[PDB]
Nucleic acid binder design. Sequence first.
RNA 1: AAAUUGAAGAGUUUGAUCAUGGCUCAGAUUGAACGCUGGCGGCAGGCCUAACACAUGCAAGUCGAACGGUAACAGGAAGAAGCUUGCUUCUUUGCUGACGAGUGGCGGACGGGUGAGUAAUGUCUGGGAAACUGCCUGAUGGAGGGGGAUAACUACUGGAAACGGUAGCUAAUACCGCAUAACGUCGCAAGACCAAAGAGGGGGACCUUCGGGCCUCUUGCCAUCGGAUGUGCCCAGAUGGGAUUAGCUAGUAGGUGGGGUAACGGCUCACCUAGGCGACGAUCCCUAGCUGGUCUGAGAGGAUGACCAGCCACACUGGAACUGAGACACGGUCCAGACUCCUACGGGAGGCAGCAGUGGGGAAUAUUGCACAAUGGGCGCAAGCCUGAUGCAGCCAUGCCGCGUGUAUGAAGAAGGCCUUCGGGUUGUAAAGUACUUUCAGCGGGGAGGAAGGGAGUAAAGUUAAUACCUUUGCUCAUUGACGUUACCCGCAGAAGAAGCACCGGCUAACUCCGUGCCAGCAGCCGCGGUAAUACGGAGGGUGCAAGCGUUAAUCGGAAUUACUGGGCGUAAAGCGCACGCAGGCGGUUUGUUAAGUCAGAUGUGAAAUCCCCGGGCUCAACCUGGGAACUGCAUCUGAUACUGGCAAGCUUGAGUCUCGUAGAGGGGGGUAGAAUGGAAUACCGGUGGCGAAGGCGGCCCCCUGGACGAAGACUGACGCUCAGGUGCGAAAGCGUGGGGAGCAAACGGUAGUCCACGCCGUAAACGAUGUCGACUUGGAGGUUGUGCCCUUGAGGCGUGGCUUCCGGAGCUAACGCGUUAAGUCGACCGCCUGGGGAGUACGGCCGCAAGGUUAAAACUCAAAUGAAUU
Lengths: 156, 88, 122, 80, 129, 205, 85, 100, 82
Amino acid sequence: ELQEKLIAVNRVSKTVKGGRIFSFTALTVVGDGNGRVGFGYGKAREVPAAIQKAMEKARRNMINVALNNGTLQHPVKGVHTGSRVFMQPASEGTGIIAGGAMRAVLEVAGVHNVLAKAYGSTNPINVVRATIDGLENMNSPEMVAAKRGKSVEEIL
Amino acid sequence: SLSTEATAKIVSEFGRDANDTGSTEVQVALLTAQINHLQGHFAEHKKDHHSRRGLLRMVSQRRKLLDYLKRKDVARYTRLIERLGLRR
Amino acid sequence: ATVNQLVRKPRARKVAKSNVPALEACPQKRGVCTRVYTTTPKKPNSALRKVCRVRLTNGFEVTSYIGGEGHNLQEHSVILIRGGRVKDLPGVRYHTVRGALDCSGVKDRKQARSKYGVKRPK
Amino acid sequence: KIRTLQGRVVSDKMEKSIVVAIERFVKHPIYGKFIKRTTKLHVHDENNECGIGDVVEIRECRPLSKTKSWTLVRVVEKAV
Amino acid sequence: SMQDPIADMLTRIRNGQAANKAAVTMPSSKLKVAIANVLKEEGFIEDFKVEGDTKPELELTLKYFQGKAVVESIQRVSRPGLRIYKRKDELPKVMAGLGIAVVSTSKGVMTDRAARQAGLGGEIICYVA
Amino acid sequence: ARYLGPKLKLSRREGTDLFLKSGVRAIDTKCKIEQAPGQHGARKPRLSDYGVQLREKQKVRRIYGVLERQFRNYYKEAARLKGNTGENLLALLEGRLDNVVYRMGFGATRAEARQLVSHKAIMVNGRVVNIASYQVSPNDVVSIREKAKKQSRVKAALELAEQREKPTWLEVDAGKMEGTFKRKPERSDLSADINEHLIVELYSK
Amino acid sequence: ANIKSAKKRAIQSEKARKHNASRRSMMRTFIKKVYAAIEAGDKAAAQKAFNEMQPIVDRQAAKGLIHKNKAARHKANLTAQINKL
Amino acid sequence: MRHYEIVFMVHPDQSEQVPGMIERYTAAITGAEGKIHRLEDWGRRQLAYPINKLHKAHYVLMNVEAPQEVIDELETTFRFNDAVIRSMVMRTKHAVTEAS
Amino acid sequence: MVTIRLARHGAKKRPFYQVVVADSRNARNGRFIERVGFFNPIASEKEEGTRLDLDRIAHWVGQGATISDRVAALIKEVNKAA
RNA sequence: AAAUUGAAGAGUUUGAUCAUGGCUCAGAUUGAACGCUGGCGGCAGGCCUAACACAUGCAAGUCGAACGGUAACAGGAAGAAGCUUGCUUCUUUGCUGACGAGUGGCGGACGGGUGAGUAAUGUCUGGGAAACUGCCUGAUGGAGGGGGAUAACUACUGGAAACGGUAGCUAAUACCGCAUAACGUCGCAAGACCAAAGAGGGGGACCUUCGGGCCUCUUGCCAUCGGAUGUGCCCAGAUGGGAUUAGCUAGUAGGUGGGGUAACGGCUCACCUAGGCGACGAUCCCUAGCUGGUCUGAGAGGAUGACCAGCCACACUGGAACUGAGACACGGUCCAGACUCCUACGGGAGGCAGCAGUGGGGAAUAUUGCACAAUGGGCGCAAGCCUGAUGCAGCCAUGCCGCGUGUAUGAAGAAGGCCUUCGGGUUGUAAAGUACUUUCAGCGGGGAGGAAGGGAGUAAAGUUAAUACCUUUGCUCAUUGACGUUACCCGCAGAAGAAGCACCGGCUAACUCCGUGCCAGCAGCCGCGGUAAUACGGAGGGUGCAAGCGUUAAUCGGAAUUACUGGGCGUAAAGCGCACGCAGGCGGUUUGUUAAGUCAGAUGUGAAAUCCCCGGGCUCAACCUGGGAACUGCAUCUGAUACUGGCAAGCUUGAGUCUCGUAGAGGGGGGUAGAAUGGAAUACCGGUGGCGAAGGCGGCCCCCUGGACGAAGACUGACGCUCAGGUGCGAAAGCGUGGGGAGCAAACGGUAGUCCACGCCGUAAACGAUGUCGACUUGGAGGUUGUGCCCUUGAGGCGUGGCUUCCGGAGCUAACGCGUUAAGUCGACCGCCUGGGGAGUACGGCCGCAAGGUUAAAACUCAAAUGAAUU
């Protein structure tokens, strides 16, 4: 039920007086297909340890994403210190059009058609954090209705 | 700056009412009197690089005041040119 | 960059020159060789690269390159060059197409024969 | 009904002819900014009716010289 | 100087929302009163008050939704540097309808939806959402 | 144009069957379909996203027997339509006359059907048609020339299709030696194992 | 040159050029006459010269030698010069 | 029209000269449109350092309102007056009152 | 003068004409001032192969524009059919 | 109802991170070329290069119903006849049809080529008056009467030829008069003037000198007003780069008068004035035919003008004008220049950037084809002729699309090859075998359509004298095809005649085995190869395409790497060293006014094409084609007035003005006091403390003050901010003039030097690595200068302006870090940046005596350089 997929692994290393202690980091995001998605960073001695640590880190902090029937609410734009992210809710059956790192974090979220673009650098951690940030601060019509004290009909 | 008995005489000679020390008509006259007074000292030793800043500043202020005069009310403007002999 | 700084001077567009100017916006010219010799490449490459200085029709003078194994290109043998940059040699961007009206294609080859102009074996 | 123009006056040195100026307000195409462009026109004049700094309403007619085909029909804001 | 009073009002609102203040005070003007009206009748504040006779000031009662910022995305569009004018059909749509844009029109200031349903556009003031 | 090499090795490279051959025997009765074709068949690496996209593309293509150019033109025409892309593309691909007669059952395999139609043996509204890529209009009666009814392979494919499944949206008449393309196929009427969004995102790259 | 039609056109053009040159020289003499007359300053002689030179230039403009506009302009100019005296 | 605070110290051998000097100076002041509302005679007193001679000098204060011209005349007259040792003069500084 | 002639627009062995009106001193596919209709020599059974605006034709011929032979036979056939 | 449905990244600097930043690649397209192969068909395309020179052939003729006539041709007549008594065979007759050459009319200004020049004279969009217009079509009238020449021709004759010359001779719709006369031209009017031609068909009555007169219709001619088409002209806006191109321009700008154009106008001339354009970019220099459009792109934009269509320019080079309605003339003329060719050595002929083709350039682009059967164009009543326009054929896989090289069964899992754990696996239903089919080429038959017309004969109406003649409207009859051995259908036979290319380390879909040992070699980046190389060569296998595959070249995309949408400038590239101020940009609040911008609506236009979506026609598609909408544009009218724009009147909080005083290392010149060795620095106050737009400012007095500050009070009314050039100030360093020069110290104790005046130079880490001006924002701890309230109830507690120093919240920041004196939230304006080296260098230009300063490249070379922060 909780879908997950490894995005990228890096041969991180921190030197010691003897030589290079080759570690292995990993990143993985989990999601149910609805407005319940969380990510997790991993850093351990091996790929299995790294992915299981990233998983257990992602088994928590379930971010609730405001989603439409099968698409995003409205175009949003986010950035976290490394690059910007821009995405447009597209039509039905036009394909999950994303680039690299964003494809995983957008397919695990259960949305199948979003028109997205990522300006800036392509650091996977930063870009996935920016995507999650831009996905969290979205908003559904009923929420704006309650905020303004109006109805979903008055805002259409 | 200048003695009060001179500023008061200027504002009573160019003031269209009582104690209008800020009406441009008395401002320009006070500024000309001050510049004519500082000219005597400026004519000496030619080496006052610093004090020329206020000189150019008040010249520019009088210029912008006359610009406002010709931009909003030209009657008094043309009426005061011949009083002090401006435009050289 | 305010809008006034753009109205007084438009966005200065910059163009990128072509790396192979001798072709003069063409895919391949005809050239006449002047010298045939070999030079060793730079570290970390160790070989004797078969190069040659070729005189072109338009009056230029550029170095060429021959690939494969063995050749017969002596002096006064006109050739054709289509271009192509290689790093291991200093600023040469001209490869000689094997099998253009003067260059005999490499012999004893059965794979990728199109790049070296080798007829079909029977 | 007759299409006319309206602008300022630059000079009247030559007799029976003045060089009026018109400032159109055009939106810049590429940068969307609104900038004022000033054009000049040689207008055939009579009796040297106007001077520098006046406003005049002019209309277009047949050419009367090498670089002058406009005539003036009425004056507004006759002051300097 | 304060060449754009609308921009000063707008950034004071931007700061009051981020400062967790309830009421903010600014020198008012007819245009700012119109903006306050089109902002209140859209459900982002409580009410407005033009207090003062010779130097009137506007009183903005910043609404709150669980203490969070009810309105957080407001920026100038037609700044003094350049004026942007949009036709009826070419009007924008902030947040696919969830955002409101203020427009100055021959029939006074009104809402973008009211403008398009009346069949005419105008000059954009700011984007509110 | 048509691929004329080892046929079942294509299904081996796919991994499942493709209804390629006649069907008188099971697929595994002749080949090790689970085993990969070629010398190196003892390895199943992790097919990447682009890998699985290309695999699905080659799958649907070799299933329908269409080359890259015509398939890309079909994709263009499908995206040219209104609304969904995958469903329209599959509807178009199912509209080919050879595939239509194969579904009606006058041919055992796609190759046999395409050979039958390319030998002037099929008629739409009584007119002979030779183009294997002729799209069939809805509610358009087809038939078969009497000059070719005496071929045993016709009756063989007929009884084979009788032993096979029966399509819904295709009105066929066995004894009449003809049929009728009732209406456009439905998204559910297809085989659900054909992923279409992979095809959508592949070409649109 | 290369076509018989070109040669016939050249011959016909030479004939027409000689004819037109003769007639136009006659017209030029007739106009210079009244021009010198009006330059002299006499009313009667200049008027008579204009009256006698009107029909010839009229017929020349009618036969297609010159357009009617040129004849009308000449007549108007000479009439203005006459009426000046 | 500015006050000044002039004070000078004279050689001890010529201390008997100052009664005439002060008279001349006050006469010139009353003739030059000045006002003197304070006068001091501190007698003889020691110095901080023995300037130009032994440590003995007389102190006399004037505190005159006379214009700057006639007061500036004082030091110029002191130039060709080699009895006084030194002199010091300050500005108005809200011109002082009774010595105290 | 101004005439009403036929312009060629089709493919090899597949002719198709467009009755237009233009100056006589212009090319076949050259400029023209107005269209009238179209003629189809290869029209199949009961096809819209011959369309003309008789009002515009009468208007132009009122100006004195000459008329070709093919369009003359075409308008004769049209007026005789219905 | 539809006219849309639209955005992908990856690799690469470090031992390891992030960021900026350069580089490469994934895609599409082409007028493409090359290499390897190559079955067919349909539709398109095919010297971008030397506007280099052309052999040769064809590309503009037609009219006998305008003319004299007869060079051939064929048809009549009259006689000569050989007697064959009508017949073969001769001479004559323009007599007939027809027609060489010639006069004349029309047509060579259409159609067709190329982009050399051509940054405005040209092009596009939208307007305007001061014009003409043969052929086309309406309206109104005439269409009378004469004259002289000449071509061809005859004779003679010059010249090598072309080309002429002399004397006679005849025609008209050729030429020239007279009459002719308006609604025309000229004149206020009165008044004057202006043109022509007949031809063809027949025929009742007369008529006749034998031709005819006469009737009729058809057609032609002249004059005027029209319509339409086309062309000429003017204006407004838009229409490349270089300011390392700052002034240009006397027919120059304007005015008067004369001439000339179809038409206004310095178009031109004489005179008079001295103006006209220019920072909103004039001149000059460098390049370009422009537009609908084409490609790419999510869009905005970017590149470009190959076919097709519209407009402009040119015809060997530079000029000129004639004819003509229309040329300043592609297959016309004249002059000058070159080239080639001919010559009998005096003189002549020509211009393929037309259709083919030749030579040369090139890597490169084709047949010295057929036909006017179609649609056009010219001529003529018509028939009819020309048409290298055009309609089709020939070559090229150059581009797009379609079909075919078999189908089913078939494990003895054949043989062989390859790998191998030597058991076997792979090739592999693949093969062989069995059964079935004949699409397309090949063979032979049939076989649509592009074809409508015109011709011969007849009926009806129109027209008369006519039932002739002519015009239409019907009918009847032979017919009118280069394509074309047509598309297409039918029968023949036989698996038959019909597949290659690139790749296999990652980017990216695919792997093993032999040779080779940093050698040969491979490579779009990383880079591999030093005896087990998945990267080189070879073998099998696999992968991706397909009659094509691959390489190269060029334009866009990723490239947000020009960032207006959509970038920045504290440490990586960047805030001028600093002020005043012109131009220019922006601008507080209220009322009133106008309605230019703006918005809404309407009208006209935005050619046809192309793209889009609905349909149709080619057996489908390509292709063609019927509707719309777009053509995001421009102009005229009406209305709206919230905003700006223009105006009028206002207001004080912005800006300032005055008063009281304050602290003042603020600056110049004139004096004074000491310490040390006549000059110089004024040590102890002195402090992340004060003064200044700024570098900088320091013992004590006289002047100008300038700025800032606190206090309330009095005043003007938006007087303001920024500011390219421009002016001024200007650490330091370097000098020039006149000096000296205690100590000092490049160079040689010790020069100049620091200092005294006049000038120059304009340079710094001129840094706060932070341009200026404003509005809004959790605090704490200080120095500093300030006055008040109340009891100063001793420097008193509170708050208040500043100037100024550290921690630090939200926030921003790649990280460090900043954080009411932001590098936070925003506005206004001006500067600078697009990888590193070359190099702030050359070339100039400008300023300076000079040193020097400002502005300021490309060629070339590399694939990194560059910041923080830890291990």
